[PDB]
């Protein structure tokens, strides 16, 4: 199989897989078949965020790519996946093809990043979903390493991924949530006039059927917590102000609460107003404590499942406290004593406090 030489075209596999960027529509030949998904698979922006493409987009890209690769007329052709020439559309197409190679074909990060390094013009880095001027970026390298590490730790499994379920529950009218990992759900706050509306009923049904044992509320009250307690789910407030970063005392209470439920096999569902910024601070801190992500990998993996998580100054906060979270495995322990501040679950405490508990008992 011969190499293809074509302007603005990057080789992934010689004679078989290429990444193009064109301001014209290319024509298929006896040696080449071209395809773009820009009209069929697209990112929905909150504000000025534009990507990366999420796990449902990636799954639909994989179906299309396989259909073209498996078509008998293309048996002797190189397949060219392409975008338009904008630096934002180029970043989305390149990052999605890399995520495909990592999750479906077992490539490692340095293998998928080599074709993209030092490309001119460069790819546009990814920004957050908030209203302030951007001041923090993550790259294709960050996203690839975060998705790869999540797959290695057992958190992504495309063989069991349910596209219809994923696409349904992201919608506001069915509850605006995503299952992020086997332990965590992130969701927007329910609403009611305390008679339940369709999205609240949708959330309560899914949580009853999928072993949610704790709900954590981070925003002001928009509903009566009794609806969760009536179906046997513990409810906990850890409220802090919109657009702020949480005090480490709140983060330690959250991590201990989550550890206590996970030890019982249950899931934790966390909401703020939108289920993006405040929720991303606490779930991100737990993922870094547990699995050792860098802060940029953690932001990239969270947005691959749920676009828009971790907003504005919360990005620099996660970046500056990543060593704290990871090294709590050595500087803290789970308490031997239950705490009323988390409804009788066990909080994270310092080594010294843990030593003095043992000394008293």
């Amino acid at each position: 199989r011969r190499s293809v030489y074509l302007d603005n075209t990057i080789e992934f596999l010689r004679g078989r897989v290429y990444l193009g960027a064109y301001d014209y529509t290319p024509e298929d030949t006896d040696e080449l078949v071209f395809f773009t998904v820009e009209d069929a698979i697209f990112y929905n922006s909150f504000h000025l965020d534009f990507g990366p493409m999420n796990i449902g987009h990636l799954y639909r890209f994989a179906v299309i790519f396989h259909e073209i690769l498996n078509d008998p007329e293309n048996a002797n052709k190189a397949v060219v996946f392409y975008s338009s020439a904008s630096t934002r559309q180029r970043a989305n197409a390149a990052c999605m093809l890399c995520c495909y190679m990592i999750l479906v074909q077992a490539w490692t990060p340095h293998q998928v990043l080599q074709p993209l390094a030092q490309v001119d013009p460069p790819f546009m880095p990814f920004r957050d979903a908030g209203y302030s001027n951007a001041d923090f970026e993550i790259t294709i390298q960050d996203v690839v390493y975060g998705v790869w590490r999540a797959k290695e730790k057992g958190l992504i499994d495309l063989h069991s991924f349910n596209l219809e379920s994923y696409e349904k529950y992201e919608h506001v009218e069915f509850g605006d949530f995503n299952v992020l990992t086997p332990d965590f759900i992130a969701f927007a706050s329910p609403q009611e006039d305390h008679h339940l509306n369709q999205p609240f009923k949708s959330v309560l049904n899914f949580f009853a059927n999928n072993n949610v044992q704790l709900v954590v509320r981070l925003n002001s009250h928009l509903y009566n917590k009794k609806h969760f307690e009536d179906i046997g789910i513990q409810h906990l407030d850890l409220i802090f102000e919109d657009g702020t970063c949480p005090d480490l005392s709140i983060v330690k209470n959250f991590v201990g609460a989550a550890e206590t439920i996970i030890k019982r096999g249950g899931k934790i569902a966390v909401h703020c107003k939108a289920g993006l910024g405040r929720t991303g601070c606490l779930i991100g801190a737990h993922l870094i404590y547990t699995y050792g992500f860098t802060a940029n990998e953690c932001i990239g993996f969270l947005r691959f499942i749920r676009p828009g998580m971790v907003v504005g100054p919360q990005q620099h906060w996660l970046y500056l406290h990543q060593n704290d979270f990871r090294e709590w495995k050595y500087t803290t322990r789970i308490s031997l004593k239950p705490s009323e501040a988390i409804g009788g679950l066990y909080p994270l405490i310092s080594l010294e406090e843990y030593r003095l508990q043992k000394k008293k008992l």
Binding site: L13, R16, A62, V63, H66, M101, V104, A106
Partner: peptide, 10 residues
């Protein structure tokens, strides 16, 4: 997927 094409790194 049932017919995943063989695109492993060489």
């Amino acid at each position: 997927f049932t017919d995943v094409p063989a695109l492993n790194y060489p």
